């Protein structure tokens with residue numbers, strides 16, 4: 001079905017344009033690295049608490065991510081309500097463990113997990129989980 | 144004062160992600176072709192007259208466009224208040240004339256202007272002009 005075409009676009013990439021909503025209601029656009037989980041139809045991204053986009057999501061969790069197909073013109077957009085973990089506070093907390101799982105999914109096995117753990121805490125990292133509630137766009141064959 | 148490095152990114156591309164505001168407050172995203180006037184500092188795109196949730200653009204013209212650089216992660220986002228022409232309604236009205244100029248600036252001389260004119264009318268095409276008010280993003284470096 002049509003949605004399968006859109007999900008295939010999301011599954012075939014690891015970068016997308018995240019749209020969050022500013023205090024004044026205007027959209028803010030950022031490019032982000034992500035991992036798509038086909039099991040639960042989720043898009044997971046690592047963000048830092050001090051960033052404007054993160055502050056936007058804290059006030060209004062509604063988010064959208066546009067992903068390009070392999071032709072660089074056709075695309076799919078995932079719409080949903082973001083679920084954020086609290087920022088990493090201690091090297092061994094649940095947020096850090098969740099970020100370790102993400103790193104493995106996106107980059108592979110880190111060389112020094114202790115260094116990674118420390119960095120997540122230092123940068124107040126947060127795991128953004130975006131369950132896809134709706135998808136739209138113009139997938140290959142439609143452009 | 145905008146970052147010349149970011150303006151250069153916009154000048155070196157012809158497509159980007161357009162973001163407008165839907166009735167429920169969520170952004171509507173799409174991949175579009177654009178023309179950038181580096182002196183007047185404005186970006187122009189052609190869109191079909193918005194309908195349904197997207198029609199809100201008619202009462203809240205705030206818009207942004209993200210443009211990808213040619214390196215790993217760099218990008219520029221142009222933000223402004225869009226100005227829209229009425230939708231094309233006649234093959235020779237002022238709107239179609241404006242869209243012909245846009246096509247020339249973006250792609251050049253068209254092979255069959257008569258085909259182009261009817262296409263604009265059939266798609267109720269609107270020329271969206273975005274005077275750049277703010278530019279943000281991650282500028283690329285030496286490469």
Ligand SMILES: Cc1ncc(COP(=O)(O)O)c(C=O)c1O
Pocket residue numbers: 029030031032046047048051052053054281
């Ligand atoms: C608000 C904001 N802060 C920071 C960044 C840089 O990314 P990171 O925090 O993962 O280093 C971005 C990238 O798009 C951003 O939009």
